[PDB]
Amino acid sequence: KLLAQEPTCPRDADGRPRVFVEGSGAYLTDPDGRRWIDFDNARGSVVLGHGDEEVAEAIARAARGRSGVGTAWSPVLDSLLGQLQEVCGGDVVGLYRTGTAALRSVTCAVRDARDRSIVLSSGYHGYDPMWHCDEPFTPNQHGIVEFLFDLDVLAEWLSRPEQVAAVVISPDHMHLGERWYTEFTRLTKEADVPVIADEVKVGLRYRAGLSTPLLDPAVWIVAKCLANGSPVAAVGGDAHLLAALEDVSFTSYFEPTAMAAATTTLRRMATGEPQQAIRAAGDRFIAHTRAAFANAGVPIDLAGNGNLFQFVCADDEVADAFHAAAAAEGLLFFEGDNQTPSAAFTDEVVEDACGRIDRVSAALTGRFTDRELTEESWYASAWGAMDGLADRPRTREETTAIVERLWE
Amino acid sequence: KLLAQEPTCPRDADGRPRVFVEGSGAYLTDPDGRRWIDFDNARGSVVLGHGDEEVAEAIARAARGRSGVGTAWSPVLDSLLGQLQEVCGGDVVGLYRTGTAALRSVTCAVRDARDRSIVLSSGYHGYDPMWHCDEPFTPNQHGIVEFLFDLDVLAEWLSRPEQVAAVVISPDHMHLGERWYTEFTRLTKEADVPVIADEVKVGLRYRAGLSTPLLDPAVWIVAKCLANGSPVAAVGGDAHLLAALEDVSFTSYFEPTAMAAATTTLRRMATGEPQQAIRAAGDRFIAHTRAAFANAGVPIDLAGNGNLFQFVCADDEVADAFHAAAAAEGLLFFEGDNQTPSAAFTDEVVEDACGRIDRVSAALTGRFTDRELTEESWYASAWGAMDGLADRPRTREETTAIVERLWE
Ligand SMILES: Cc1ncc(COP(=O)(O)O)c(CNC[C@H]2O[C@H](O[C@H]3[C@H](O)[C@@H](O)[C@H](N)C[C@@H]3N)[C@H](N)[C@@H](O)[C@@H]2O)c1O
Ligand SMILES: Cc1ncc(COP(=O)(O)O)c(CNC[C@H]2O[C@H](O[C@H]3[C@H](O)[C@@H](O)[C@H](N)C[C@@H]3N)[C@H](N)[C@@H](O)[C@@H]2O)c1O
């Protein structure tokens, strides 16, 4: 009753937030003492594991004033800014406390520098009202055009490039591939329109760098993979497009525990070693789960890879039964969205999660053996996770029909 | 050269950031080993003291997952929301990572609830471009009218009340008195326009509550005094005006170290004891300093009280000389803005600081003896610290003239 906001979090079947009282590594403990395996991981921001020792020791020293104070520039900030630039590229870098803040600030800065009114957008960019819209493919009141990753619509808007300030996309790699990114970049280069790569979720997710070399971003944003859940986002890119960032300052800019979490996490993420380990362990869990369901005739497949994957169910009913069965075994999934294991998802935890998937499979057998994975199932589950249209061959009339089905 | 932003921080006379390696209580240590007394305190967000051990212990435990994880609701959140509603009041509460984000979210929500386009504003509300304006007393492109705490301009805009969604003010108590607040509240009650009290700086600063009972805010925001520098801001007030906050969610919402810092700090700030101790200690420093300058012919006075005060210098040459002399003695002032001691500013620190101020006064004696504080000195100093016009008697044409001198 007290809380005016509606934060995204795991919720039970009746909509009330699931309470977890402690966590460590890959395991969460609920009030009754039951241990769950976390695949949500603070919506993908805990990439090293809950309570990671090295980060925790750095945070504790920073809370005791040993590595700088919030009053002033600290010795470690230069190394943070320098490594961000080495890993992600760009002329200049900037820092924020949320992805929402970073996305609003850089989009306004790029719009100002370009002196053009229209921004074309696909993917989620945060909660700020500037992104709200009543319908896709047309400007909202802030000049933003949602194009749902549809390149026919994008091509049309870019055929009048004079008025387009920038294209901002949150890249997805479960449902968009080489073909889509090659044509996206071809179109934007032809229009000479700068691209803002919103890599809040996928920046540093797959390797020590941005998510695909097929994109050529003028500006990038990363956050979830940067600080093991502490509130830090970073931006970088072309100096003239980010000129307006000179007016950005906020009180907690130099707060030392966030600085400790970001520097300690980035030094490790910049080696690529956590992403490689997560990839191997997650790949094993995916392969085990895919074969389990296929052998038991459960109509649920997987998209993505070990770093970032999602469940594709034939229908809503299937997804509901899956989610109840998963919860009963102590698997904590981000329901209808993407699963992002952390480095704490070791070989032993994989074994444990596979045993829990074995029991979910056994609890779903013979209930939905008839149902097929239709094109409708693939678009609906992709729409939940990457917030637009999957790259699957389709007619223009089919685009309209999908959007009519799925738009909120 | 890497940073695209210009964060507010102590800088030397050439504009380069002063670097500090470590801090404990009221003392900072610089790279050369010199100890400085901090009056800036992360722009007033460190109210207990750098490295406060009780907060550090709670942060360290939270960093190890001992009371919750960023994935999910936990009991620490229930207690925090309850503590906020108990100290500040209101129907509902919400949380943010910065004062800037909180102010933008509540202002948009209130404007949408009121279905009116004009917001009247005084004081600083954060870095977001929605507050940028070319001229005072006229609506910017977002419908916001800056009125610089001038109640004659406010009365003019409230004489046409039907299009005024809200009045948002950052209360000042160094240069605005009881008479200002009683007339402000009378005018806004008469127009039936809700008041948003931006108490990011002054909320809990002076007592265990908001800054003055002479305001009747429909919505309040606090931050600086909440978490000893960790990135937490809170809002609350009338449920119907904050209904759009149901759309607010962000990835780090459940981040446990920030919640640990806030619950621990707020528990101490809710007793009123830290603010009483700071008031007493800061008052002793102010009295000593005012007399040191006065008895040496140095044209520098002080405004405010022990919780929050500022220097008022005859002119900018005096202020520049004062700031250079202060840094030479290891006093770390928020230059040209307000000083906010922490609870680590104990009597032993007061005595040290008074000796340093004696040396500052000695360094300035004889340089500026023939200069005096004018009304222009008071308006210029107030403008830098509270971002509007001091409450001194003046006509409407004198207001225009002062603003023409000070508007940047
Ligand atoms: C790509 C991207 N850009 C910006 C942000 C905003 O960052 P902050 O949260 O730090 O401000 C994010 C945030 N990612 C959160 C999830 O967004 C989508 O899912 C839904 C959210 O769960 C919900 O809270 C929103 N109201 C709607 C949104 N569609 C993604 N499906 C999910 O994968 C993300 O974890 C970015 O991801
Ligand atoms: C009252 C108030 N509301 C909102 C904010 C924004 O909070 P966040 O910083 O967490 O986003 C603040 C912040 N206060 C910081 C200082 O602001 C003013 O000082 C100047 C700033 O330092 C500078 O960055 C700005 N460009 C201009 C601004 N005038 C206050 N004078 C200073 O006293 C504050 O400490 C609020 O204070």
CSV table of N, CA, C and O in Angstrom, one decimal, chain A residues 32-101:
chain,number,residue,atom,x,y,z
A,32,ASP,N,11.3,-19.4,4.2
A,32,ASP,CA,11.2,-20.7,4.7
A,32,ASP,C,12.5,-21.5,4.7
A,32,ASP,O,12.4,-22.7,5.1
A,33,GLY,N,13.6,-20.9,4.3
A,33,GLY,CA,14.8,-21.6,4.2
A,33,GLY,C,15.1,-22.4,2.9
A,33,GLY,O,16.2,-23.0,2.8
A,34,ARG,N,14.2,-22.3,1.9
A,34,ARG,CA,14.4,-23.1,0.7
A,34,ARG,C,15.4,-22.3,-0.2
A,34,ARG,O,15.3,-21.1,-0.3
A,35,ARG,N,16.3,-23.0,-0.9
A,35,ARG,CA,17.3,-22.5,-1.7
A,35,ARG,C,16.9,-22.6,-3.2
A,35,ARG,O,16.6,-23.6,-3.7
A,36,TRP,N,17.0,-21.4,-3.8
A,36,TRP,CA,16.7,-21.3,-5.3
A,36,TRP,C,17.9,-21.0,-6.1
A,36,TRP,O,18.8,-20.3,-5.6
A,37,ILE,N,18.0,-21.4,-7.3
A,37,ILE,CA,19.1,-21.0,-8.2
A,37,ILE,C,18.6,-19.8,-9.0
A,37,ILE,O,17.6,-19.8,-9.7
A,38,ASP,N,19.4,-18.7,-9.0
A,38,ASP,CA,19.0,-17.4,-9.6
A,38,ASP,C,19.5,-17.4,-11.0
A,38,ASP,O,20.7,-17.4,-11.3
A,39,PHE,N,18.6,-17.2,-12.0
A,39,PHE,CA,18.8,-16.9,-13.4
A,39,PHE,C,18.5,-15.5,-13.7
A,39,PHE,O,18.8,-15.1,-14.9
A,40,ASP,N,17.7,-14.8,-12.9
A,40,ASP,CA,17.4,-13.4,-13.1
A,40,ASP,C,18.5,-12.5,-12.8
A,40,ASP,O,18.9,-11.7,-13.6
A,41,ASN,N,19.1,-12.6,-11.6
A,41,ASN,CA,20.4,-12.0,-11.2
A,41,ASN,C,20.3,-10.4,-11.4
A,41,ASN,O,21.1,-9.8,-12.0
A,42,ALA,N,19.3,-9.9,-10.7
A,42,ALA,CA,19.0,-8.5,-10.7
A,42,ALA,C,18.9,-8.0,-12.2
A,42,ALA,O,19.5,-7.0,-12.6
A,43,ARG,N,18.0,-8.7,-12.9
A,43,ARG,CA,17.7,-8.4,-14.3
A,43,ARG,C,19.0,-8.4,-15.2
A,43,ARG,O,19.1,-7.6,-16.1
A,44,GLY,N,20.0,-9.2,-14.8
A,44,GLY,CA,21.2,-9.3,-15.6
A,44,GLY,C,22.3,-8.4,-15.1
A,44,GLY,O,23.4,-8.4,-15.8
A,45,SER,N,22.2,-7.7,-14.0
A,45,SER,CA,23.3,-6.9,-13.5
A,45,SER,C,24.3,-7.6,-12.6
A,45,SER,O,25.4,-7.1,-12.4
A,46,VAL,N,23.9,-8.7,-12.0
A,46,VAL,CA,24.8,-9.5,-11.2
A,46,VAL,C,25.5,-10.5,-12.1
A,46,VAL,O,24.9,-11.5,-12.4
A,47,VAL,N,26.6,-10.2,-12.7
A,47,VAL,CA,27.3,-11.0,-13.6
A,47,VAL,C,28.4,-11.8,-13.0
A,47,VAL,O,28.8,-12.9,-13.5
A,48,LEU,N,28.9,-11.4,-11.8
A,48,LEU,CA,29.9,-12.2,-11.1
A,48,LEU,C,29.4,-13.1,-10.1
A,48,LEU,O,30.0,-14.2,-9.8
A,49,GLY,N,28.2,-12.8,-9.5
A,49,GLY,CA,27.6,-13.6,-8.5
A,49,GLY,C,27.3,-12.8,-7.3
A,49,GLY,O,28.0,-11.8,-7.0
A,50,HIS,N,26.2,-13.1,-6.6
A,50,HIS,CA,25.8,-12.4,-5.4
A,50,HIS,C,26.9,-12.5,-4.4
A,50,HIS,O,27.4,-13.6,-4.1
A,51,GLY,N,27.2,-11.4,-3.7
A,51,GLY,CA,28.2,-11.4,-2.7
A,51,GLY,C,29.6,-11.8,-3.1
A,51,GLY,O,30.4,-12.2,-2.3
A,52,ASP,N,29.9,-11.7,-4.4
A,52,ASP,CA,31.3,-12.0,-4.9
A,52,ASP,C,32.3,-11.4,-4.0
A,52,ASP,O,32.3,-10.2,-3.6
A,53,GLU,N,33.2,-12.3,-3.5
A,53,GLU,CA,34.2,-11.9,-2.5
A,53,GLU,C,35.1,-10.7,-2.8
A,53,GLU,O,35.3,-9.8,-2.0
A,54,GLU,N,35.7,-10.7,-4.0
A,54,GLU,CA,36.6,-9.6,-4.3
A,54,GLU,C,35.9,-8.3,-4.4
A,54,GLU,O,36.4,-7.3,-3.9
A,55,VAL,N,34.7,-8.3,-5.0
A,55,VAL,CA,33.9,-7.0,-5.0
A,55,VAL,C,33.5,-6.6,-3.6
A,55,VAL,O,33.6,-5.5,-3.2
A,56,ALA,N,33.1,-7.6,-2.8
A,56,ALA,CA,32.6,-7.3,-1.4
A,56,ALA,C,33.7,-6.7,-0.6
A,56,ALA,O,33.5,-5.7,0.2
A,57,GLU,N,35.0,-7.2,-0.7
A,57,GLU,CA,36.1,-6.6,0.1
A,57,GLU,C,36.4,-5.2,-0.4
A,57,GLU,O,36.8,-4.4,0.4
A,58,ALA,N,36.3,-5.0,-1.7
A,58,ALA,CA,36.6,-3.6,-2.2
A,58,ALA,C,35.5,-2.7,-1.8
A,58,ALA,O,35.8,-1.5,-1.4
A,59,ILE,N,34.2,-3.1,-1.8
A,59,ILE,CA,33.1,-2.3,-1.3
A,59,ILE,C,33.3,-1.9,0.2
A,59,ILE,O,33.1,-0.8,0.6
A,60,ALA,N,33.7,-2.9,1.0
A,60,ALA,CA,33.9,-2.7,2.4
A,60,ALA,C,35.0,-1.7,2.7
A,60,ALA,O,34.8,-0.8,3.5
A,61,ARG,N,36.1,-1.8,2.0
A,61,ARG,CA,37.2,-0.8,2.2
A,61,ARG,C,36.7,0.6,1.7
A,61,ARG,O,37.0,1.6,2.4
A,62,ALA,N,36.0,0.7,0.6
A,62,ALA,CA,35.5,2.0,0.2
A,62,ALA,C,34.5,2.5,1.2
A,62,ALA,O,34.4,3.8,1.4
A,63,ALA,N,33.6,1.7,1.8
A,63,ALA,CA,32.7,2.2,2.8
A,63,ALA,C,33.5,2.7,4.1
A,63,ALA,O,32.9,3.5,4.8
A,64,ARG,N,34.7,2.3,4.3
A,64,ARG,CA,35.5,2.8,5.4
A,64,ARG,C,36.4,4.0,5.0
A,64,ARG,O,37.3,4.3,5.8
A,65,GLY,N,36.2,4.5,3.8
A,65,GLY,CA,37.0,5.7,3.4
A,65,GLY,C,38.4,5.4,2.9
A,65,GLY,O,39.1,6.4,2.6
A,66,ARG,N,38.7,4.2,2.7
A,66,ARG,CA,40.1,3.8,2.3
A,66,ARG,C,40.4,4.1,0.9
A,66,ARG,O,41.6,4.1,0.5
A,67,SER,N,39.5,4.3,0.0
A,67,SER,CA,39.8,4.4,-1.4
A,67,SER,C,39.0,5.6,-2.0
A,67,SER,O,38.5,5.6,-3.1
A,68,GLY,N,39.1,6.8,-1.3
A,68,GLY,CA,38.5,8.0,-1.8
A,68,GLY,C,37.3,8.4,-1.0
A,68,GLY,O,36.8,7.6,-0.2
A,69,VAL,N,36.8,9.6,-1.2
A,69,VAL,CA,35.6,10.1,-0.6
A,69,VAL,C,34.8,10.7,-1.7
A,69,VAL,O,35.2,11.1,-2.7
A,70,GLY,N,33.5,10.8,-1.4
A,70,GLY,CA,32.5,11.3,-2.3
A,70,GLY,C,32.7,12.8,-2.6
A,70,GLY,O,32.1,13.3,-3.5
A,71,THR,N,33.5,13.5,-1.7
A,71,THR,CA,33.7,14.9,-2.0
A,71,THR,C,34.5,15.2,-3.2
A,71,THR,O,34.3,16.2,-3.9
A,72,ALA,N,35.4,14.3,-3.7
A,72,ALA,CA,36.4,14.7,-4.6
A,72,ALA,C,36.8,13.5,-5.5
A,72,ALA,O,36.6,12.4,-5.3
A,73,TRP,N,37.5,13.9,-6.6
A,73,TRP,CA,38.1,13.0,-7.5
A,73,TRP,C,39.0,12.0,-6.7
A,73,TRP,O,39.7,12.4,-5.8
A,74,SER,N,38.9,10.8,-7.1
A,74,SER,CA,39.6,9.7,-6.4
A,74,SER,C,40.7,9.1,-7.2
A,74,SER,O,40.6,9.2,-8.5
A,75,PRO,N,41.7,8.5,-6.7
A,75,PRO,CA,42.8,7.9,-7.5
A,75,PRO,C,42.3,6.9,-8.5
A,75,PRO,O,42.9,6.7,-9.5
A,76,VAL,N,41.2,6.2,-8.3
A,76,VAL,CA,40.8,5.1,-9.2
A,76,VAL,C,39.9,5.5,-10.3
A,76,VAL,O,39.8,4.7,-11.3
A,77,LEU,N,39.4,6.7,-10.3
A,77,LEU,CA,38.5,7.1,-11.4
A,77,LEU,C,39.2,7.2,-12.8
A,77,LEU,O,38.6,6.8,-13.8
A,78,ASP,N,40.4,7.6,-12.8
A,78,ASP,CA,41.1,7.7,-14.1
A,78,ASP,C,41.2,6.3,-14.8
A,78,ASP,O,41.0,6.2,-16.0
A,79,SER,N,41.4,5.3,-13.9
A,79,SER,CA,41.6,3.9,-14.5
A,79,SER,C,40.2,3.4,-14.9
A,79,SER,O,40.2,2.6,-15.9
A,80,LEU,N,39.1,3.8,-14.3
A,80,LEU,CA,37.8,3.4,-14.7
A,80,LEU,C,37.5,4.0,-16.1
A,80,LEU,O,37.2,3.3,-17.0
A,81,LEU,N,37.7,5.3,-16.2
A,81,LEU,CA,37.4,6.0,-17.5
A,81,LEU,C,38.3,5.5,-18.6
A,81,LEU,O,37.9,5.2,-19.7
A,82,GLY,N,39.6,5.3,-18.3
A,82,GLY,CA,40.5,4.8,-19.3
A,82,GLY,C,40.2,3.4,-19.8
A,82,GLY,O,40.3,3.1,-21.0
A,83,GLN,N,39.8,2.5,-18.9
A,83,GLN,CA,39.5,1.1,-19.3
A,83,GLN,C,38.2,1.1,-20.1
A,83,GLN,O,38.1,0.3,-21.1
A,84,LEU,N,37.2,1.8,-19.7
A,84,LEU,CA,36.0,1.9,-20.5
A,84,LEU,C,36.3,2.3,-21.9
A,84,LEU,O,35.8,1.7,-22.8
A,85,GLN,N,37.1,3.4,-22.1
A,85,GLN,CA,37.5,3.8,-23.4
A,85,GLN,C,38.3,2.7,-24.2
A,85,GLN,O,38.0,2.5,-25.4
A,86,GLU,N,39.2,2.0,-23.5
A,86,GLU,CA,39.9,0.9,-24.2
A,86,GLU,C,39.0,-0.2,-24.6
A,86,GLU,O,39.2,-0.8,-25.7
A,87,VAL,N,38.0,-0.6,-23.8
A,87,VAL,CA,37.1,-1.7,-24.1
A,87,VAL,C,36.1,-1.4,-25.1
A,87,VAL,O,35.8,-2.1,-26.0
A,88,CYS,N,35.5,-0.2,-25.0
A,88,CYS,CA,34.3,0.2,-25.8
A,88,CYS,C,34.6,1.2,-26.9
A,88,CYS,O,33.7,1.3,-27.8
A,89,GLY,N,35.8,1.8,-26.9
A,89,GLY,CA,36.0,2.9,-27.9
A,89,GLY,C,35.4,4.2,-27.6
A,89,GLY,O,34.8,4.4,-26.6
A,90,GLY,N,35.6,5.2,-28.5
A,90,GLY,CA,35.0,6.5,-28.4
A,90,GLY,C,36.0,7.6,-28.0
A,90,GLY,O,37.1,7.3,-27.4
A,91,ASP,N,35.7,8.8,-28.3
A,91,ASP,CA,36.5,10.0,-27.9
A,91,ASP,C,36.4,10.3,-26.4
A,91,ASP,O,37.4,10.7,-25.8
A,92,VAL,N,35.2,10.3,-25.9
A,92,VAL,CA,35.0,10.8,-24.5
A,92,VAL,C,34.0,9.8,-23.8
A,92,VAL,O,33.4,9.0,-24.5
A,93,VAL,N,34.0,9.8,-22.5
A,93,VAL,CA,33.2,8.9,-21.7
A,93,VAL,C,32.4,9.7,-20.6
A,93,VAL,O,32.8,10.8,-20.3
A,94,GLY,N,31.4,9.1,-20.1
A,94,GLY,CA,30.6,9.7,-19.1
A,94,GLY,C,30.0,8.6,-18.2
A,94,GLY,O,29.9,7.5,-18.6
A,95,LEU,N,29.6,9.1,-17.0
A,95,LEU,CA,29.0,8.1,-16.0
A,95,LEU,C,27.6,8.6,-15.5
A,95,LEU,O,27.4,9.8,-15.4
A,96,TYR,N,26.8,7.6,-15.2
A,96,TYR,CA,25.4,7.8,-14.7
A,96,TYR,C,25.1,6.8,-13.6
A,96,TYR,O,25.9,5.9,-13.4
A,97,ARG,N,24.0,6.9,-13.0
A,97,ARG,CA,23.6,6.0,-11.9
A,97,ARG,C,22.6,5.0,-12.4
A,97,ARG,O,22.4,3.9,-11.8
A,98,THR,N,21.8,5.2,-13.5
A,98,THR,CA,20.9,4.2,-14.0
A,98,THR,C,21.1,4.2,-15.6
A,98,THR,O,21.5,5.2,-16.2
A,99,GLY,N,20.6,3.1,-16.2
A,99,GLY,CA,20.5,3.1,-17.6
A,99,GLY,C,19.5,4.1,-18.1
A,99,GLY,O,19.7,4.8,-19.2
A,100,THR,N,18.4,4.3,-17.4
A,100,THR,CA,17.4,5.3,-17.8
A,100,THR,C,18.0,6.7,-17.9
A,100,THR,O,17.8,7.4,-18.9
A,101,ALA,N,18.8,7.1,-16.9
A,101,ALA,CA,19.4,8.4,-16.9
A,101,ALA,C,20.3,8.6,-18.0
A,101,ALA,O,20.3,9.6,-18.7
